[PDB]
């Protein structure tokens, strides 16, 4: 199936306390494999998955250098953005960055992305074709000109199209037991009477990887959108995920409703009935 | 990150070509390099710029070699200066700043058309019984001894250019605090 490599960076200013919190984590699809925490004692990019441990010193010294370069850039950016918006030194603010590349079943480059947000809102983003920025505000317009002057998009694009995919290919090989597995959902249904006249049907999917899944409720072969509640897909803690969808139904009508499960390790979707 | 100018001092004959070396260290794919000229005014004057991603003064930018030599052809006397190589990072170590080399003091040397080495005793314009010794008109190869006695002072050489007469001449000066000082012995 398709795969991705994504890095995520979070920078949180703490007025009156000194340096902002900086956290970085790196993912291959839904498996984290590296991390850095401004508050941990090592000040090194740390491994989080067995297969990245094979990389030797130059890889680690490099990623630590790079992650620190991100840390420092964010640290300045918090100050710069406060000025861009004439905000005071009083409140805590957040910068977030996310970039990465996607590849198809052939492991060939599909797409790249690089976006940046301040205070939880889109600030600036590389366009789909990796050649220009989308900057909605005036502040982002200012940034856009600076990044143009320093050939940021040209150099990012080279990274995202080459280095990003080459190392994803490498990771997928080095951790093929971990990363290339497809664990199919284990499914079941529970039932709890709400009132005299209603009952909850809950559709359960457990221990699946990857996290991408679809759970849909169905009355009489038609797609339910009314009374239907879907929780956030949630990590079990062992590299698998869980999700449920519930639907409130009139008592004695249960057999009108089907749950439909779609996932990569199911050749056909599952139709569950109560 | 660091910059290396291995030669603190260098000489060239006027109208000839000279090359000042410069190497640098960095772990980064993108960065910028610079040559600054510092004439006796002390100003730092930008002379060359180079981005790693992609006229008498020229650079030989050898990125694989991490080498960034500056070539001055057809040296004028106005090129006598200290030349600095500077490194500027992109995102990594030493980004948002310049790191300098230690500098090369370049001395451009004129040709003395008619050498005529001689020592002259000048006298103060004010009735001062004080005097100075001038050693002048010696050829550019002449190295001027440093003061043997601490009571005697001797300057470095210095080239003046009498543009009007297309004429150049070296000189040094020697005076002493001691009474009865002889100019004839000053530079021996």
């Amino acid at each position: 199936g398709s795969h991705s490599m994504r890095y995520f960076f979070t920078s949180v200013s703490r007025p009156g306390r000194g340096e902002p919190r900086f956290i970085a984590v790196g993912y291959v699809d839904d498996t984290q494999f590296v991390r850095f925490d401004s508050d941990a004692a090592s000040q090194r990019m740390e491994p989080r998955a067995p297969w990245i441990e094979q990389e030797g010193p130059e890889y680690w010294d490099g990623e630590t250098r790079k992650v620190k370069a991100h840390s420092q850039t964010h640290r300045v950016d918090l100050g710069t953005l406060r000025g861009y918006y004439n905000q005071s030194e009083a409140g805590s603010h957040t910068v977030q960055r996310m970039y990465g590349c996607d590849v198809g079943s052939d492991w060939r480059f599909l797409r790249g992305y690089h976006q940046y947000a301040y205070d939880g809102k889109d600030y600036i983003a590389l366009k789909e074709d990796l050649r220009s920025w989308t900057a909605a505000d005036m502040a982002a317009q200012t940034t856009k000109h600076k990044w143009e002057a320093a050939h940021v998009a040209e150099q990012l694009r080279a990274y995202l199209e080459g280095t990003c995919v080459e190392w994803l290919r490498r990771y997928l090989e080095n951790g093929k037991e971990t990363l290339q597995r497809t664990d199919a959902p284990k499914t079941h249904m529970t039932h709890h009477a709400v009132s005299d006249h209603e009952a909850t049907l809950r559709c359960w999917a457990l221990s699946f990887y990857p996290a991408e899944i679809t759970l849909t409720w169905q009355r009489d072969g038609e797609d339910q959108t009314q009374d239907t509640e879907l929780v956030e897909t949630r990590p079990a803690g062992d590299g698998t995920f869980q999700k449920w969808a519930a639907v409130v139904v009139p008592s004695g009508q249960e057999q009108r409703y089907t749950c439909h499960v779609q996932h990569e390790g199911l050749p056909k979707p599952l139709t569950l009935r109560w | 990150q660091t910059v290396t100018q291995s030669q603190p001092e260098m000489s060239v004959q006027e109208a000839e070509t000279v090359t000042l070396s410069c190497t640098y260290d960095t772990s980064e794919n993108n960065y910028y390099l610079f040559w600054y000229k510092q004439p006796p005014s002390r100003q730092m004057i930008l002379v060359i710029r180079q981005e790693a991603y992609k006229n008498r003064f020229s650079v030989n930018f050898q990125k694989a070699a991490k080498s960034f030599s500056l070539k001055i052809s057809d040296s004028q006397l106005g090129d006598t200066a200290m030349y600095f190589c500077a490194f500027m990072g992109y995102s990594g170590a030493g980004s948002y700043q310049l790191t300098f080399g230690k500098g090369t003091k370049l001395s451009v040397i004129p040709n003395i058309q008619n050498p005529d080495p001689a020592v002259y005793q000048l006298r103060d314009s004010k009735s001062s019984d004080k005097s100075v010794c001038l050693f002048t008109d010696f050829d550019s190869q002449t190295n001027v001894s440093q003061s043997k006695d601490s009571d005697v002072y001797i300057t470095d050489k210095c080239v003046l250019d009498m543009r009007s007469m297309d004429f150049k001449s070296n000189s040094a000066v020697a005076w002493s605090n001691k009474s009865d000082f002889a100019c004839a012995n000053a530079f021996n």
């Binding site: 991100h70 953005l81 990044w147 | -």
Partner: peptide, 9 residues
């Protein structure tokens, strides 16, 4: 493998 390409906004 992270990028090196980040610059002050």
């Amino acid at each position: 493998h992270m990028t090196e390409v980040v610059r002050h906004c």
